[PDB]
Ligand binder design. Structure first.
Ligand SMILES: OC[C@H]1O[C@@H](O[C@H]2[C@H](O)[C@@H](O)[C@H](O)O[C@@H]2CO)[C@H](O)[C@@H](O)[C@@H]1O
Length: 324
C-alpha cells in the first residue's frame, strides 16, 4: 500500500546466479545506449498506472568494471545514473539493487569470496552518490541463496548498512535480504529473520531497515513458468505477517510476478489484495520484469508505446497496477 513498482531490467543481463556478471552483456534499458524507453516506461507506470517506485538491477562488476571493491567506474556509472535520474524524474522512489546473489565470480561474500570490507566499500561509494536524496532505497543484495552460515551473512549486511549510514545516507530505507533466494516462505523458518533482526543502524535503532523478500506464483517458486498455481497467502504471507507484526518489523516484496494468463490474474489479484490488507507489515510489491525484455518473455510486463499511447501487459492492467 505504501509502494507499488516494477523492476526495470537490463543492466543485470549476463548476471549469473553464481555472481559472475559478464559485464559485456550489460544492456541499459534506455533509448540512447540502444535499449528500450525505460524512462518512458516509467513516465507511464506513474502517470497512468499509479506506480510509485522502480527497482533498477545492476551488477557489481558493471559498477566497478570487473573489480570486487568500491572504486566506481565513471563511464559505467554515468549510464546507470541516467536510469536512476529517469526514475526520479518520473516522480517515483528508486531501489538501487546490486544484483549479485551474494556472490562475486563463483565465490561468496564474507564466506569464501570478497570480504565484508571489499563489499562495504562498494556501498559506501554508492551511498555517497545519492546520500542527500531521500527517494533512494538501497537494496543491499539480490537473492542470496545456498549460503552456508546466515549469521555471517547478516554480519556482511551490517557492514554495508554501517557503510551506508556513514556516507550520510541517514534518511533512506535499506532492504535486508536473506537466504533461499530471499524466498518469503522460508524467510523465518531458515533463520534469515532472526539473524537479520540483529542488524542495526549506528545509533542502535532498526528505523528504516526493512526485510527484502521475493515470491513467485509457480509450483517451484522459480518464476520460469507461465502458469500460476497459488497466491502464497497460506504458506508465505500469512505466517510472515504474524511474525513481522509481533516483532514490530516490516518487509518489502521486491520481486514477484507471473504470466500474462487467466490463472495468474486470479491468483495474483488474491496475493495483492492480501498484501494491501496487511499494509502495516508489508511496505509494497514490485513486479518482475519490464525494461528491455522482449515481448514473449514469460514474466513480461513491458508496455507498448504507440505514438504516445501506452498499453500494458494483461497482468499489469488486470492485477498489479494500483490504478485497478
Ligand atoms: O525464485 C527466485 C529465483 O529462483 C531461481 O530458481 C530456484 C528457486 O528459487 C527454488 O525455489 C528452486 O527449488 O530451485 C531454483 C534453482 O534450482 C531462479 O533461477 C531465478 O530466476 C529466480 O529469480
Amino acid at each position: 500500500l505504501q509502494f507499488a513498482g516494477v523492476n526495470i531490467a537490463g543492466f543485470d543481463f549476463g548476471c549469473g546466479s553464481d555472481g559472475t556478471c559478464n559485464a559485456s552483456g550489460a544492456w541499459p534499458p534506455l533509448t540512447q545506449y540502444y535499449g528500450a524507453d525505460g524512462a518512458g516506461q516509467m513516465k507511464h507506470f506513474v502517470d497512468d498506472d499509479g506506480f510509485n517506485v522502480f527497482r533498477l538491477p545492476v551488477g557489481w562488476q558493471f559498477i566497478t568494471d570487473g573489480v570486487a571493491g568500491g572504486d566506481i567506474d565513471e563511464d559505467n556509472w554515468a549510464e546507470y545514473d541516467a536510469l536512476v535520474q529517469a526514475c526520479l524524474d518520473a516522480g517515483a522512489s528508486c531501489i538501487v539493487d546490486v544484483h549479485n546473489y551474494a556472490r562475486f565470480n563463483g565465490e561468496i561474500i564474507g564466506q569464501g569470496g570478497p570480504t565484508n570490507q571489499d563489499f562495504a566499500a562498494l556501498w559506501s561509494s554508492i551511498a555517497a552518490k545519492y546520500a542527500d536524496n531521500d527517494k533512494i532505497i538501497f537494496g543491499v543484495m539480490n537473492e542470496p541463496h545456498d549460503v552456508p552460515d546466515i549469521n555471517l551473512w547478516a554480519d556482511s549486511v551490517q557492514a554495508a548498512v554501517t557503510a551506508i549510514r556513514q556516507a550520510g545516507a541517514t534518511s533512506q530505507i535499506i532492504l535486508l535480504p536473506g537466504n533461499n533466494w530471499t524466498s518469503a516462505e522460508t524467510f523465518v523458518s531458515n533463520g534469515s529473520a532472526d539473524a537479520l533482526k540483529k542488524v542495526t543502524n549506528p545509533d542502535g535503532s532498526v528505523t528504516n531497515l526493512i526485510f527484502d523478500v521475493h515470491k513467485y506464483l509457480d509450483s517451484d517458486n522459480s518464476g520460469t513458468h507461465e502458469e500460476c498455481t497459488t497466491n502464497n497467502i497460506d504458506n508465505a504471507w500469512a505466517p510472515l505477517a504474524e511474525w513481522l507484526r509481533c516483532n514490530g518489523r516490516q518487509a518489502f516484496n521486491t520481486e514477484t510476478g507471473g504470466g500474462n494468463v487467466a490463472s495468474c490474474e486470479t491468483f495474483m489479484c488474491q496475493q495483492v489484495a492480501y498484501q494491501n490488507a496487511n499494509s502495516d507489515v508489508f511496505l509494497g510489491y514490485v513486479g518482475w520484469a519490464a525494461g528491455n525484455f522482449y515481448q514473449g518473455y514469460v514474466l513480461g510486463e513491458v508496455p507498448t508505446d504507440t505514438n504516445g499511447v501506452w498499453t500494458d501487459t494483461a497482468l499489469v492492467s488486470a492485477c498489479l497496477a494500483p490504478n485497478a
